[PDB]
Design a binder for this molecule. Structure first.
Ligand code: MG
Ligand code: MG
Ligand code: MG
Ligand code: MG
Ligand code: MG
Lengths: 70, 106, 117, 123, 145, 143, 53
RNA sequence: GACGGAGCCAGCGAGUACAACCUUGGCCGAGAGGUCUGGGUAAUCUUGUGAAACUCCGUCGUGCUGGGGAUAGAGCAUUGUAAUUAUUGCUCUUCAACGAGGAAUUCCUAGUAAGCGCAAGUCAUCAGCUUGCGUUGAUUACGUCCCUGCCCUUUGUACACACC
């Protein structure tokens, strides 16, 4: 185990703040930025994916790529 | 007075293909001369019988292997006919090597 | 009677081989070369080629009949269902087996080997 | 005292029940192999050997051991009808002595004999 | 589907049945860390308890834990067929026995002792320190115990 | 025009079927559900515990619809695969024998599957209608 | 004439005899041939067997 | 990647009447399997051998870990008179060595290498093996004698049982 795969409110808040004005919104990228796990990242994305903000490019399993609203 | 159609299958099995073919041709010619409704010399997947063996009697050399194969040729000749005519045909129509066999009835 | 066609053919081949071997063994003095099996309904013809056809024949129905009986005993078939004919081979010189047999005979009796060859 | 150590049971049955059940009951309360064997045709397996064992039991000097019953059928299963008797299991050379205990229940005769010598040089 | 929030309603890093249950693992495959506790068996236990397979191992209500423990002790009292056990129909007692945590090892030891006492081929092999299931060692495993 | 049934991209159809089954509540659960490996080449049952058997059933039904006289053995073969044999290489062993049978029975009970002559199973007419409806729904979802 | 002069030899390499030598060694049971392979590899040509590929 | 699902695709095969074959299809068994009816002395039935590898979604995300299933206990079966020295089979468990392999060197120039199964040979029972056959399917040469082995020429030889 290498940690940073918890839950928390602070983490959620951080995630919320880290969404607009970014080139990549990918699971791997998220993991790299020392955030939540592979499945959790997707969930987080989904929660922000209600009224624009983050929009998909690829829908494939374990190779998902999303980008900001232009 | 008779003439009751049974529909008769003729089996032609063998190895030496040329002979078999000749026999088939002969049969068809005979059918033509007695003038009958008939399905042709229907050919089946010519079964190969493979027996693969170490060439060595005793297992001391390089691992040479030989596939001894037996080519088989299965032929169906279907006749729309009574039995008497078939019997007449099968009085002759036998050539060495080739198996002549009458299945009889549909 | 009746098996799978392939199997039947294989069995027939084996039978032929066996017969050939027997003739090589039994008809050694008779100068045998080849067997020519013809299987028809009821009467199965068995042609046999030899150098000394007279020996094979015997004195009208001697050895040949015995051989027929033996064959019947071997393969369950009845009297009349197996027929045996003994024939002259058309020039033995081209036939290798016959030549080999002749050579063997020459060797066994007592003769020069190289010269015989 | 009321219970001696712990009851040496087959599948929840005491020695008061174990010694008196015959073969069928043992089979019922046994590993599958034994059952299978019972199912297949029995001849010359429990024929004379069993009789010999019984004779030994009868002719025992009391409290002491019965006579050692020699077996070639080392593929035989140990049944609680003859606990206490000594069996001479054949290995090619020497019928070797084996005790029949309250814990040899439904095991094989061969697994207490061994033909070859155990390994030397180093364990 | 949703991230589990709150400040700290459920406590991380657990200790259940004489051993340790590490968090950050989803339900089942932290219970495999327990000596003897199954995969399929674990799943069955979870089902019996009535827990979702989305929670973390570093969570769980106390009541739920108690229920799980109860399930572990007796396979017969709850809806478990119980032929997924270390001792089914059994070698001595003749019931339904799937040993738990630090007890399985003890049971194994006892069995070994029994085998030794009997002096079966297997027992002999064990004593020697070799190969039980007719496996040959002419070539393989040249260090051993 | 014409509402098609085969033209559905596989998984969606199955999902729809599952949803329908969930809505109805009429199937009769085998009972040995979750206490089973489902495949002989399995170390884990279905991952989502409850459900997934429904999906399996749906898949079976779809296969039946596609083909002619279909039986238990064939189903087993279908839902088998590769065995983790450790040191030994993989073979091919089939699915659990009874579970598929149970599924078939359940389908028969609901009226999706009918018994065919010669040896196997086919589709009931009400069942066919239901399948068609499901397909239509799926199409609507897509369109 | 002795009473016990046969083992239960229903199968195995024992019951399986060759058609020429009677060997229990390398017996092509296939196609109902029952020959020790070596002999076959000599007689095969007459048995109708040939090699092509 | 792993595990579930879910999708779903070959080609060689071979297989009984005087027997103990290949065996569908249906009820009972979590498996393993059994049983009643078959069909096939075989392009016709097992069989479209609905094989694996592969392709979609979710769950766990670089931990000797859910990678890996190795030493092992327990039942039920099955084969065969006979299974202990697990024949084999599946189920729960235990869950180790092994984080891309040192010196050497094997194989290969296209449906070739490698992967992935199937079938036959075996065979009462067993596959990790062989033969075969498909199924995915590239890198880099398209050369040269440097190494290895052979080959021929020219050379020398006191060897010709020939450099052991
Ligand atoms: Mg793997
Ligand atoms: Mg086919
Ligand atoms: Mg582990
Ligand atoms: Mg082998
Ligand atoms: Mg000089």
């Amino acid at each position: 185990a290498k940690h940073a795969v918890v839950l928390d409110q602070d983490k959620f808040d951080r995630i919320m703040k880290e969404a607009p004005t970014y080139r990549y919104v990918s699971v791997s990228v998220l993991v790299d930025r020392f955030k939540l796990g592979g499945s959790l990242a997707r969930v987080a994305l989904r929660h922000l994916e209600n009224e624009g903000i983050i929009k998909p490019v690829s829908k494939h399993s374990k190779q998902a790529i999303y980008t900001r609203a232009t | 007075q008779e003439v009751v159609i049974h529909k008769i299958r003729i089996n032609l099995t063998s190895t030496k293909v040329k002979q078999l073919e000749n026999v088939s041709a002969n049969i068809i010619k005979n059918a033509e001369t007695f003038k009958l409704v008939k399905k042709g010399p229907v050919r089946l997947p010519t079964k190969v019988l493979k027996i693969s063996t170490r060439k060595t009697p005793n297992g001391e050399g390089s691992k040479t292997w030989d596939t001894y194969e037996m080519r088989i040729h299965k032929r169906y000749i279907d006749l729309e006919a009574p039995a008497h005519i078939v019997k007449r045909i099968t009085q002759i129509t036998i050539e060495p090597g080739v198996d002549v066999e009458v299945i009889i009835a549909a | 009677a009746i098996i799978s066609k392939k199997r039947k053919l294989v069995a027939d081949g084996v039978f032929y081989a066996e017969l050939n071997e027997f003739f090589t063994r039994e008809l050694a003095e008779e100068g045998y070369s080849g067997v020519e099996v013809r299987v028809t309904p009821t009467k199965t013809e068995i042609i046999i080629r030899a150098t000394k056809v007279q020996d094979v024949v015997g004195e009208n129905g001697r050895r040949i009949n015995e051989l027929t009986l033996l064959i019947e005993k071997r393969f369950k078939y009845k009297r009349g269902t197996i027929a045996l004919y003994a024939e002259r081979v058309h020039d033995r010189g081209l036939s290798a087996v016959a030549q080999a047999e002749s050579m063997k005979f020459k060797l066994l009796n007592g003769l020069a080997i190289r010269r015989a060859a | 005292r009321k219970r001696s150590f712990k009851t040496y049971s087959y599948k929840g049955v005491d020695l008061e029940k174990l010694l008196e059940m015959p073969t069928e009951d043992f089979v019922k309360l046994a590993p599958a192999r034994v059952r299978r064997k019972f199912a297949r045709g029995l001849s010359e397996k429990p024929a004379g050997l069993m009789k010999k064992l019984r004779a030994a039991k009868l002719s025992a000097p009391e409290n002491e051991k019965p006579a050692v019953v020699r077996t070639h059928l080392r593929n035989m299963i140990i049944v609680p009808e003859m606990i206490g008797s000594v069996v001479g299991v054949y290995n090619g050379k020497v019928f070797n002595q084996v005790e029949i205990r309250p814990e040899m229940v439904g095991h094989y005769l061969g697994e207490f004999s061994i033909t070859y010598t155990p390994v030397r040089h180093g364990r | 589907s949703l991230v589990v929030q709150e400040q700290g309603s459920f406590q991380h890093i657990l200790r259940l049945l004489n051993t340790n249950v590490d968090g950050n693992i989803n339900v089942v495959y932290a219970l495999t860390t327990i000596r003897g506790v199954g995969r399929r068996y674990a799943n069955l236990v979870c089902k019996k308890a009535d827990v979702d397979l989305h929670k973390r191992a570093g969570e769980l209500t106390q009541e739920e834990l108690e229920r799980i423990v109860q399930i572990m002790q007796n396979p017969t009292h709850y809806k478990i067929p119980a032929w997924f056990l270390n001792r089914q129909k059994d070698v001595n007692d003749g019931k339904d026995y799937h040993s738990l945590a630090n007890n399985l090892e003890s049971k194994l030891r006892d069995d070994l002792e029994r085998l030794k006492k009997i002096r079966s081929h297997r027992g002999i092999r064990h004593f020697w320190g070799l190969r039980v299931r007719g496996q040959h060692t002419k070539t393989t495993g040249r260090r051993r115990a | 025009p014409g509402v098609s049934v085969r033209d559905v991209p596989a998984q969606d159809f199955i999902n729809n079927y599952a949803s329908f089954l969930q809505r109805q509540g009429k199937l009769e659960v085998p009972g040995y559900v979750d206490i089973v490996k489902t495949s002989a080449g399995n170390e884990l049952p279905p991952q989502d515990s409850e459900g997934w058997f429904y999906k399996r059933a749906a898949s079976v039904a779809r296969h039946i619809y596609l083909r002619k006289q279909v039986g238990v053995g064939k189903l087993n073969k279908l839902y088998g695969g590769a065995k983790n044999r450790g040191v030994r290489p993989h073979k091919h062993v089939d699915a659990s024998g009874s579970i598929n049978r149970k599924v078939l029975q359940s389908l028969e009970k609901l009226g999706v599957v009918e018994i065919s002559p010669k040896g196997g199973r086919r589709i009931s007419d009400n069942g066919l209608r239901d399948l068609d409806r499901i397909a239509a729904a799926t199409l609507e979802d897509e369109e | 004439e002795n009473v016990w002069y046969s083992h239960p030899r229903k199968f195995g390499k024992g019951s399986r005899q060759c058609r020429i030598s009677g060997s229990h060694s390398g017996l092509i049971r296939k196609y109902g041939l029952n020959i020790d392979r070596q002999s076959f590899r000599e007689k095969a040509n007459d048995i109708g067997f040939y090699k092509y590929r």
